Design a protein around this ligand. Structure first.
Ligand code: HEC
Length: 86
């Protein structure tokens, strides 16, 4: 997908809580590869579903982000997780 648009969606909607791929709200639910894989979330469609619907203290973005923005940011997250979030 568009990784330039994902990074920008992410800086605008996700980084308050996940800067650097971590998680200041629930410290074990990070965006690193091994963590996503432990929970069955290392997939484009798992991330899209959770971005759209929310989960516990993760807000829902259905209706605040377009389908394209959500697709982009899911792709960005997966790209970064692959690279270790350097
Ligand atoms: C804080 C207010 C957050 C914002 C803004 C976003 N997310 Fe988040 N995320 C948050 C929590 C509390 C959790 C855990 C929820 C639970 O109880 O299970 C998460 C989880 C995720 C995950 C899965 C992480 C994992 O299983 O290891 C992903 C993939 C994720 N969040 C991505 C994400 C994106 C792309 C966001 C912007 C659109 C975003 N989050 C916002 C907290 C918060």
């Amino acid at each position: 997908a568009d990784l330039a648009n994902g990074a920008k969606v992410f800086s605008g909607n996700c980084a308050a809580c996940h800067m650097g791929g971590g998680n200041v709200v629930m410290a074990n639910k990070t965006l690193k590869k091994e963590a996503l894989e432990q929970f069955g979330m290392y997939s484009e469609d798992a991330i899209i579903y959770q971005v759209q619907h929310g989960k516990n203290a993760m807000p829902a973005f259905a209706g605040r982000l377009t389908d394209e923005q959500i697709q982009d940011v899911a792709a960005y997250v997966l790209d970064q997780a692959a690279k270790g979030w350097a």
